[model samples]
Target: AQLKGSKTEENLKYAFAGESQANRRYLYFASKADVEGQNDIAALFRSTAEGETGHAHGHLEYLEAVGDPATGLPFGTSRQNLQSAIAGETHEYTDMYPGMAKTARDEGFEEIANWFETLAKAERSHANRYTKALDGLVD
Candidate 1:
């Protein structure tokens, strides 16, 4: 077992991030499939997403990244849900990932920095998508 402050720990962190991101990406894919009336494809995406979650959980266990990981959201109308999604994306893009990118860059972790940059861009895109959805939904 690798201890903290080692290369193994750092790589484990990277793997955790990648797997977790994949899990979320697959959920997005599943939702898109559902929208297109492709139940089989959606199911495939969901299964793949579950596998990614397993990988992420394993990595987290190795790294001792333990915590209560449940995020409970209140029931909301479509418009309200879209607003919440938009806010979440905005925070990820503007606040969370920007700081993470800067820190990774400063630490000379180019790969992590690039990952953060990519994540930030994706979050911004998600925010735009949610904004469009909000605009289309009636309050």
Candidate 2:
């Protein structure tokens, strides 16, 4: 039981880091995606950034609500260093969230699992938006 709890704590810490990275990424994307055109993609990035903010907060709340230790991610991630953070989020969406969701479901955290699933969907959409922007279809 103690070992299981330890593993869960580590997972939560990593999950929080990923969510923080995602929040930073979307906001960065919003900042650079427009500034010159219709700003559709930029607008989406802004809203999605807000959405990721909620997810990070939600995870914190979930830990509090569950009476689990709310261990945060490792420190020293700089806000002004946006490009690296965006890359981190891209990796999280493609590599982390799915595994996190599966674990949440396996742990019987149905609502939390659903939340990650929803977040993954939005993150993927955000990725597509960037792709469209690169292709000049974000108009």
lDDT of 2 by residue, 73-103 (tens): 2222232123333445566678678889999
Q: What is the Cα-based lDDT of residue 43 in candidate 2? A: 93
Model 2 TM-score, 2 decimals: 0.41
User: Residues 11-99, candidate 1, lDDT per residue (tens digit)?
Assistant: 77788889999999999999999999999999999999999999998886665432212212322457655766777788899999999
CA lDDT, candidate 2, residue 52: 78
TM-score of each candidate structure, all chains considered together: 0.49, 0.41
Which candidate comes out best when scored by TM-score? 1
Q: Name the weakest run of 10 consecutive residues (lDDT summed) in model 2.
A: 71-80
Residue 67 lDDT in candidate 2: 36
Top lDDT prediction, candidate number: 1
Candidate 1 residue pairs in backbone clash: none
lDDT of each: 0.80, 0.65
lDDT of 2 at 50: 85
